[PDB]
Structures are given as C-alpha cells and as structure tokens.
C-alpha cells in the first residue's frame, strides 16, 4: 500500500515520501486526517513533477545567483566615500556600500543580505562576502576627501 506522506511521522516520515502501510491504517487515519495520500500514478508522478520543479527552480536561484559570482566579485568595489583620517563622515552600510555600489555601473544589492554588520565608521580598508550557497567574495573602498 504505497503512500506519499506529508507531516513527517515516526518510523515513517518526511513529506512527499512514499512508504507502504496497511490499507487499514492509510484508509482510516492517514487519508482522513490529511497526513498522506494514495501513491497513485495520478499523484505519484505529480510528485516528481514538483520534485524537479523545485530543484530546477532552486537551480535558478543558485545558477543565475552564480552569474553574480564571477562578475561582481572580482570587478572590485569602487566607493568614493567622504571620509577623513581615522573615522569616516557617513559610515558605510547597504545605504552606502550598496547604494553607491549601484551607481558604479549598475550594481544591485541587498540591505543586510551580504555580510553586513555595523556601519564601517572607521577609515581604513575592509572586505566581506555575499550570501548564501555558496556565495561570492567582494571588497570595499574607504575613500577620503
């Protein structure tokens, strides 16, 4: 009695998994409470048809998410910050690193999705990395005027 699951259970669990039970159990518990469904061709194939469509769907958020690897990692950041000495005038965060990062030549960034922390606020030179899976490393430029 093949049966595709949902709410992972003991000694048989983890969604979309197919584990055969006894008609009795499936018939009057699992199917009644929506804790699984018949491993029918109908569903059984529509499973893979949603198993691939999430792997090849995630293979686009780590594929086109990787075209951003070998591009905006080496082509280092060029930030003309208005600093001065040992403590800049405007720190540095997404509102900074990213903001102007965009200006450079069209660099789209995230608010905290990178390696963010506290806004630089300290003249020198730092470098962080993107995120996640498996992410890409890029630098920074603590400029002065």
């Amino acid at each position: 009695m093949k049966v595709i699951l949902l709410e992972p259970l003991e000694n048989l669990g983890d969604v979309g998994q197919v584990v055969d039970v006894k008609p009795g159990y499936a018939r009057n518990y699992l199917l009644p409470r929506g804790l699984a469904v018949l491993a029918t061709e109908s569903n059984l194939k529509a499973l893979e048809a949603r198993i691939r469509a999430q792997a090849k769907r995630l293979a686009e958020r780590k594929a086109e998410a990787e075209r951003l690897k070998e591009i905006l990692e080496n082509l280092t950041l060029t930030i003309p910050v208005r600093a001065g000495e040992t403590k800049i005038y405007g720190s540095v965060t997404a509102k900074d690193i990213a903001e102007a990062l965009s200006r450079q030549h069209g660099v789209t960034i995230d608010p905290k999705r990178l390696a963010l922390e506290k806004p630089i606020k300290e003249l020198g030179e730092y470098v962080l990395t993107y995120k996640p899976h498996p992410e890409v490393p890029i630098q920074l430029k603590v400029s002065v005027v």
Partner: protein
Amino acid sequence: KVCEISGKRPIVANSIQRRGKAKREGGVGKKTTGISKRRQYPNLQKVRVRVAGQEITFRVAASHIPKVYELVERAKGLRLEGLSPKEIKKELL
C-alpha cells in the same frame, strides 16, 4: 444485497455432501448424500467518505473497496455542492 461499484449480487449455489474415501486416494469413491440449494452473498461493507461538504456512504463489496477512494480522488474535478449527499453519490460516475 448488491455492490454499488461492481453490481455484485448474491448468486445461487448448491451444497453438495459427499461421503466415503476419494477414489483419488484409497478407493471406491465418494457418494453424494445430499444436494441443497443455497445462496452465496458478497462480502459487502459500509464505506463513509467526506467528499465535498456532505458525508456519503457506500454498500460496497469489500473486494472493490479501493475503487471507492479512486472516485473520491477524481471527484475533485466536478462541482459538487448544493446541500445534497443524495445527488453527490448519484453524481459519482
């Protein structure tokens, strides 16, 4: 009575009574002491399923029980409402 899926119904069968040793084995053979008419009924049970809002139930030969949930599945492609589990059952194929 009668199965709502397969239309299985009670058939008529005899009730043969043999005696003696089977020629197959020892010898002489078996003799029939009495033939009697009788019925063999299907092993039909009651199957309650939800489907839509109403309930619905089935007098179905146990043998076919599954075919019940085969319908309850492909029953989600039709438009079954209007408070009536009498028309919902009717509906199912």
